[PDB]
Structures are given as structure tokens and as C-alpha cells.
Design a protein around this ligand. Sequence first.
Ligand SMILES: N#CC[C@H](NC(=O)c1c[nH]c(/C=C/C(=O)N2CCCC2)c1-c1ccc(Cl)cc1F)c1ccc(F)c(Cl)c1
Ligand code: NA
Length: 302
Amino acid sequence: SAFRPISVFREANEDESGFTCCAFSARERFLMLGTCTGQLKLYNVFSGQEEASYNCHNSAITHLEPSRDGSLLLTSATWSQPLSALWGMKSVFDMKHSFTEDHYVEFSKHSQDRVIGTKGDIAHIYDIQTGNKLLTLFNPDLANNYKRNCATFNPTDDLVLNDGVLWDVRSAQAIHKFDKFNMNISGVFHPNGLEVIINTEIWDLRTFHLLHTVPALDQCRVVFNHTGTVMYGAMLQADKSPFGSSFRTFNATDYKPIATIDVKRNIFDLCTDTKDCYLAVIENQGSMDALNMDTVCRLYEV
Ligand SMILES: N#CC[C@H](NC(=O)c1c[nH]c(/C=C/C(=O)N2CCCC2)c1-c1ccc(Cl)cc1F)c1ccc(F)c(Cl)c1
Ligand code: NA
């Protein structure tokens, strides 16, 4: 895969830039950029200009997820309460609900009517409308205690992976524990609905057998392109930039290695657009020994 840098966004009216995460708007107009002070900046991709600034947190934004319908946004931050929140993005920018001690959140996938939050080894499922906690998912007997566990729904919303344990949501119980082969990473569902990727191990969802071991995915966070044909993986720094300077691409259909991309700067986040046209990467432009970070967003043609 080739990645041509075409633009750079820098926190305007500032000496050093403080972006920490990125997501493309559900409709193609904006790049949403979270900052190290807890703001969310909306940049017009075409004009290159900031058009809005929203107040979300009082510490660095760690995670952004826009709903597909364009109406809602999840955020997470690093140490200020609430650690996660849900925002409405219609006429007014509103906090709809917060998830005060959950340090990571995602939407449900099939129908975006729920949020799943993670607090340590525990998952919480919330109703978007009421904000009420519907489920708590934790089994002390099956737990892997992954240090960087993040809970997630599968594509049809009927299963959750939490701490390497598969849960049936409708009957609220664990159905399988995947064996523990690392200390940190808890895994994700492939958008195809057929595999679960837990660190270096690719598991078959139908039979639960190990299909592949991919050493290059060790300690990686993973994201797919819109059509689910390319998987991006970047290795976390040992637990400050969350990643090192490289990410790798794989063909999502057979896991075939594509490319290693080293931008020679530490990476804070990576996001893809809906049209498979652009990749945005938050990169520390600052020198190795600089006292302060200078994290910009670089836009790449895919
Ligand atoms: N969403 C999304 C995209 C996803 N981003 C992250 O995973 C991500 C992006 N950022 C933080 C964390 C900041 C953080 O802790 N900070 C930043 C400022 C101070 C502390 C995390 C992150 C790290 C650990 C955990 Cl277990 C989960 C997290 F979401 C990603 C997927 C593939 C990739 F190739 C890349 Cl480069 C990124
Ligand atoms: Na496949």
C-alpha cells in the first residue's frame, strides 16, 4: 500500500500542536481532532481550516467514535472525570450521557442503540436513550485480566468480547474463554463476523479453533478500512505517545501482509475515511529530545 502525505493540520493559534486522536465525520466534510486539553476541533478537510471547537474533557482525549448517522459522538479521556461521554451533534453540541469511570467506550455495531464501556476487567453495556446500565459483564472464574482490556461488540451485536471471553448478550453469560498468550491485549472482531483477532492469535468464531498466529500483530491496536478489505495494526509502546513510529497493513480476507509504513515520528492515532480515499495519522513532529510534544495531523492519500 502507498501513502502519499498531502496535508498537515496543526492546532491553529498555538506554538506547539496538541492533537491526540482523530476520526472522520460520518458524512465526508470534517476531520474531528481531539486535543491534549480535552477539546474536540472540527477541521474542514477540503479547506484545511478549523470550523468548530467543542469542550469535552479536562485531560487529553484518547478515543473518538462518531455514530454512522452523524448525530452522536463517543469520547474518552485520560484522567479527568468523566473518563468517557456521549455527545449529540445536532443543533447544539450537548453531552447526552457520561460513563464516568469507563476509560474506553464503543458503539454497538448493527443497530447503534447501545454503548459498551470498559473499566479494568469489566464491561458495561448502556442504553443510548436512557443512559442506564443494562448489563455488567465480568466472570472472575474466566477472566484473563488483560492489562489493556477493551470490550467490544461483534458486527451483529449478539456477542461481546471482554477480556478475551466471548459473551452471549441476550442470555447474559460467557460462552467461551480464549486462552491467554499475552499480558495486555484483549482483542477485536473482524468486520466479516467470522474471526476474532486477539493479539497475535486469529481464532475461528464458528469452531473456536486457532486459525493463524501473526507475530507482527503483537501488542497492536487494529482498525479496518470502511469496506473491511484492509487491516491496519500499530504496536503500542510498553506501558507519552501510545504507539511507536510504524504501522502495518494486511489484506483483511486472508491476513496477507501488505506494507510496513514507518513515518519516523511517534504515532498517537490513525483513522480512515468512509470512501477508502484518505488515512489521517496523528504524529509527534517534535524532535527526540524536545521538552514538549508537537502533535500534528497528517492526511495521506491511500
Ligand atoms: N479508535 C481507534 C484507532 C486506534 N487508536 C487507538 O487504539 C488509540 C489511540 N490513542 C490511544 C491512547 C491514547 C492515550 O492513552 N494517551 C494519549 C494522550 C495521553 C495518553 C489508543 C489506545 C491505546 C491502547 C488501548 Cl488498549 C486502546 C486505545 F484506544 C488505532 C488502531 C490502529 C492503529 F494503527 C492505530 Cl495507530 C490506532
Ligand atoms: Na478470510
